[PDB]
Design an enzyme around this catalytic site. Structure first.
Site, PDB file in Angstrom:
ATOM      1  N   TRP A   1       7.249   8.817   9.184  1.00  0.00           N
ATOM      2  CA  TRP A   1       8.212   8.170   8.299  1.00  0.00           C
ATOM      3  C   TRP A   1       9.555   7.969   8.987  1.00  0.00           C
ATOM      4  O   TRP A   1      10.615   8.067   8.369  1.00  0.00           O
ATOM      5  CB  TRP A   1       8.351   8.957   7.000  1.00  0.00           C
ATOM      6  CG  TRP A   1       7.004   9.110   6.368  1.00  0.00           C
ATOM      7  CD1 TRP A   1       6.108  10.116   6.581  1.00  0.00           C
ATOM      8  CD2 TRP A   1       6.372   8.197   5.461  1.00  0.00           C
ATOM      9  NE1 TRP A   1       4.967   9.897   5.849  1.00  0.00           N
ATOM     10  CE2 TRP A   1       5.101   8.730   5.149  1.00  0.00           C
ATOM     11  CE3 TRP A   1       6.759   6.989   4.879  1.00  0.00           C
ATOM     12  CZ2 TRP A   1       4.212   8.097   4.268  1.00  0.00           C
ATOM     13  CZ3 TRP A   1       5.878   6.362   4.002  1.00  0.00           C
ATOM     14  CH2 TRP A   1       4.620   6.917   3.708  1.00  0.00           C
TER      15      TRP A   1
ATOM     16  N   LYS B   1       4.661   2.352   4.519  1.00  0.00           N
ATOM     17  CA  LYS B   1       5.580   1.633   3.656  1.00  0.00           C
ATOM     18  C   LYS B   1       6.365   0.679   4.540  1.00  0.00           C
ATOM     19  O   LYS B   1       6.319   0.777   5.769  1.00  0.00           O
ATOM     20  CB  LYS B   1       6.510   2.595   2.906  1.00  0.00           C
ATOM     21  CG  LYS B   1       5.909   3.151   1.608  1.00  0.00           C
ATOM     22  CD  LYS B   1       6.885   4.049   0.854  1.00  0.00           C
ATOM     23  CE  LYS B   1       6.286   5.428   0.607  1.00  0.00           C
ATOM     24  NZ  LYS B   1       7.031   6.158  -0.459  1.00  0.00           N
TER      25      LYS B   1
ATOM     26  N   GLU C   1      -8.911 -19.567 -18.556  1.00  0.00           N
ATOM     27  CA  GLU C   1      -8.724 -18.858 -19.825  1.00  0.00           C
ATOM     28  C   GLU C   1      -7.508 -19.460 -20.520  1.00  0.00           C
ATOM     29  O   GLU C   1      -6.383 -18.953 -20.460  1.00  0.00           O
ATOM     30  CB  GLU C   1      -8.560 -17.361 -19.594  1.00  0.00           C
ATOM     31  CG  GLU C   1      -8.523 -16.509 -20.872  1.00  0.00           C
ATOM     32  CD  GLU C   1      -7.636 -15.272 -20.741  1.00  0.00           C
ATOM     33  OE1 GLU C   1      -6.951 -15.124 -19.702  1.00  0.00           O
ATOM     34  OE2 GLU C   1      -7.645 -14.426 -21.662  1.00  0.00           O
TER      35      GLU C   1
ATOM     36  N   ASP D   1      -6.919 -16.195 -15.335  1.00  0.00           N
ATOM     37  CA  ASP D   1      -6.502 -15.614 -16.600  1.00  0.00           C
ATOM     38  C   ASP D   1      -5.073 -16.037 -16.948  1.00  0.00           C
ATOM     39  O   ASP D   1      -4.294 -16.460 -16.090  1.00  0.00           O
ATOM     40  CB  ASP D   1      -6.627 -14.086 -16.544  1.00  0.00           C
ATOM     41  CG  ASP D   1      -8.082 -13.612 -16.357  1.00  0.00           C
ATOM     42  OD1 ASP D   1      -9.021 -14.395 -16.640  1.00  0.00           O
ATOM     43  OD2 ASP D   1      -8.295 -12.457 -15.907  1.00  0.00           O
TER      44      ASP D   1
END
Length: 687
Positions: free
Chosen positions: A96, A133, A400, A358
């Protein structure tokens, strides 16, 4: 005296439905926006020359996110973050370290980039499946930490990790030593000619156990069931990563990561591959209508600003009125690159065969279904262009859209949205209305025929009698409406069924069959309803103390030949395979000969086949006349009264049905049929 001029780019749609005439101009503007974006996209090249839409989307996912070079052992990572001043790759691989791996090169596009050399070892610099990250330093000096926006895997934190930092997901550098190799071709399928019968499934609930079932378990235990049923396609919901299980997949956090709760990417490739080996198409629920509001493990405030992936909160167009989610700014070129490559990624890397989009109603209208949003609609147009370009003549897109927005399913060259199908989202409520508010001797046959056949010209429809919404908590299934909370004692074969169970079993097959045969151009069945699955669906959430008791599918019920659930299931398999052998779905609408209001009999022809329904609650009919156009010999190819489907075996399926040359019900010939109360049959002519 202004001559009403229909612009050429919507000439096809106006021809298909002249109702569209007074809107021709607005339709033309909608398509023109998309066609200009299409030109823009196809000239986003170094020298400004033309590239294909496919190459644009493929180059995007090939060069964004992280990529391990397997022959030089380097790793490249690029990330779009215009508001960040600096970007650092961090994770387990550098303990990190917030200084050693700066993404020093920031594009004119606002993209940071970094190339990690191989270790002195020669190993990859980031270990397979370790955590990472991206850190951004903003102009004010503050820091934010994010999961890369194109990460291919994000995992729930451990009990130890979740206690120390919280429920935020963890980004994973997925780079396995042996990536899965596909072995099987995609099934032979032509969209224009072939029917598609679709099984709507969810990996996590696909086991009788109260757990998150895996991709491997679906492949081994659920696929063989779906082949036996004879569906052409599986509609996989809740694949795109979503931190919140109870969102049923609709709160997407990591758009390029298949959900890790069910397994690894290689586990999902295997699932699709073996389905392909079984002749079954696989479609993905794609949620491009909105994104989860999560920061750090989602896209919210990704680069520190409020105007990157989404419209800003002050703009008034940035958040959904009900869903507590952020709305994409489709007018941003990188957002267009992000979503379009997302489509090409699922088609190419996982070998999906199509998509259901959707939240299309939420996209189409500036109020999101409580004024059309040209930008959102134009992205869907582009999306249909790419998907159909990726798999020409076979690719499937399903919308949809509860609004039934006209032209959504007309081709792009006609001036339409380019969607192959829309969901018949209104049909389930028709059956609910009847079972809740009308007694059986009140059923209007004409209203049933009208609702089932009320379909816009040119706009093919996926019909179903109930969907994943209806099975969810808050609603009741057709099984529950028909038979209430029937136990294994009520459902035993070794005792004659009560009036309620006898009526429930029969109507359950019949409602499916008339929906299947008259209600649309495709068919859909939500996992479990095919055998009248009891109870309801429900995901773990605070409201039920995180119970998994309803987050499952009791497939064991199908396997017990002393329960009646197998009767419903075997009829379903016989329904799909009959249609497969005698096509009626992807065909022109039926010619309805009869909709008798006293007899409660509905009869129609579709693609040459004969469909007869006796919905009368009590009255059987012998030698009932049915008008037939083409003369010949007819034989029953599907019979709901068959004992193996739970009927009483009254109809003789070996009978030959000879037409006779007397006009009946505005048809030149007629046959005579035995149809007991609450039974249906399907006949075909013999060659």
């Amino acid at each position: 005296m202004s001559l009403t001029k229909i612009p050429e780019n919507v000439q096809g749609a106006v021809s298909i439905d002249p109702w569209l005439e007074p809107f021709a101009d607005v339709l033309s503007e909608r398509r023109y926006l998309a066609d200009k974006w299409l030109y823009d996209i196809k000239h986003a090249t170094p020298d400004g020359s033309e590239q294909s839409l496919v190459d644009f989307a493929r180059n995007a996912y090939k060069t964004y996110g992280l990529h391990a070079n397997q022959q030089t052992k380097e790793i490249v990572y690029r990330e779009w973050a215009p508001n960040a001043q600096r970007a650092f790759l961090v994770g387990e691989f550098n303990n990190w370290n917030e200084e050693s791996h700066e993404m020093k090169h920031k594009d004119e596009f606002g993209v940071f980039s970094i190339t990690l050399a191989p270790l002195e070892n020669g190993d990859f610099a980031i270990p397979h499946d370790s955590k990472i990250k991206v850190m951004f330093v903003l102009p004010d000096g503050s820091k934010v930490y994010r999961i890369p926006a194109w990460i291919t895997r994000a995992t729930q934190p451990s009990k130890e990790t979740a206690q120390k930092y919280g429920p935020t997901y963890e980004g994973r550098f997925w780079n396995p030593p042996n990536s899965y190799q596909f072995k099987h071709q995609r099934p032979k399928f032509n969209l224009a000619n072939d029917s598609i019968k679709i099984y709507e499934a969810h990996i996590g609930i696909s086991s009788p156990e109260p757990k998150v079932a895996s991709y491997k378990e679906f492949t081994q235990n659920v696929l063989p069931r779906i082949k036996h049923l004879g569906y052409d396609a599986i509609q996989l919901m809740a694949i795109m990563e979503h931190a919140y299980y109870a969102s049923f997949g609709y709160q997407v956090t990591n758009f390029f990561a298949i959900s890790s709760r069910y397994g690894t990417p290689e586990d999902l490739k295997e699932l699709i591959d073996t389905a392909h080996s079984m002749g079954i198409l696989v479609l993905l629920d794609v949620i491009h209508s909105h994104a989860s509001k999560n920061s750090e493990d989602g896209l919210n405030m990704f680069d520190g600003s409020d105007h990157q992936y989404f419209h800003s909160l002050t703009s008034g167009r940035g958040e959904h009125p009900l869903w507590d989610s952020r709305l994409f700014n489709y007018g941003s070129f990188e957002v267009q690159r992000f979503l379009l490559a997302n489509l090409a990624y699922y088609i190419d890397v996982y070998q999906f065969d199509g998509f259901r989009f959707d939240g299309v109603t939420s996209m189409l209208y500036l109020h999101h279904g409580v004024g059309v949003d040209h930008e959102a609609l134009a992205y869907l147009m582009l999306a249909n262009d790419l998907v159909h370009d990726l798999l020409p003549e076979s690719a499937v897109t399903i919308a949809e859209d509860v609004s039934g927005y006209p032209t959504l399913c007309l081709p792009r060259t006609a001036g339409g949205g380019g969607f192959d199908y829309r969901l018949a989202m209104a049909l389930p409520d028709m059956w609910i209305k009847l079972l809740k508010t009308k007694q059986d001797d009140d059923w209007d046959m004409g209203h049933i025929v009208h609702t089932l056949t009320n379909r816009r010209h040119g706009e093919k429809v996926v019909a179903y009698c109930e969907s994943h919404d209806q099975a969810l908590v808050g609603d009741k299934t057709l099984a529950f409406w028909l038979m209430d909370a029937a136990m294994y004692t009520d459902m035993t074969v070794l005792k004659e069924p009560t009036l309620v169970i006898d009526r429930g079993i029969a109507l359950h097959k019949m409602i499916r069959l008339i929906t299947h045969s008259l209600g649309g151009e495709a068919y859909l069945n939500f996992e479990g309803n095919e055998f009248g699955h009891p109870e309801w669906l429900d995901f773990p959430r605070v409201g039920n103390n995180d119970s998994y008791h309803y987050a499952r599918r009791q497939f064991n019920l199908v396997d017990d030949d002393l329960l009646r659930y197998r009767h419903l299931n075997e009829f379903d398999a016989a329904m799909q395979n009959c249609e497969s052998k005698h096509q009626w779905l992807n065909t022109p609408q039926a010619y309805v000969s009869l909709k008798h209001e006293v007899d409660k009999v509905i009869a129609f022809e579709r693609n040459g086949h004969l469909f007869v329904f006796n919905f009368h609650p009590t009255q059987s009919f012998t030698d009932y006349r049915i008008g037939v156009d083409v003369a010949g010999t007819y034989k029953i190819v599907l019979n709901t009264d068959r004992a193996e489907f739970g009927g009483h075996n009254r109809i003789d399926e070996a009978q030959e049905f000879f037409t006779t040359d007397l006009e009946w019900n505005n048809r030149r010939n007629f046959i005579q049929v035995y149809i007991p109360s609450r039974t249906a049959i399907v006949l075909t002519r013999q060659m």
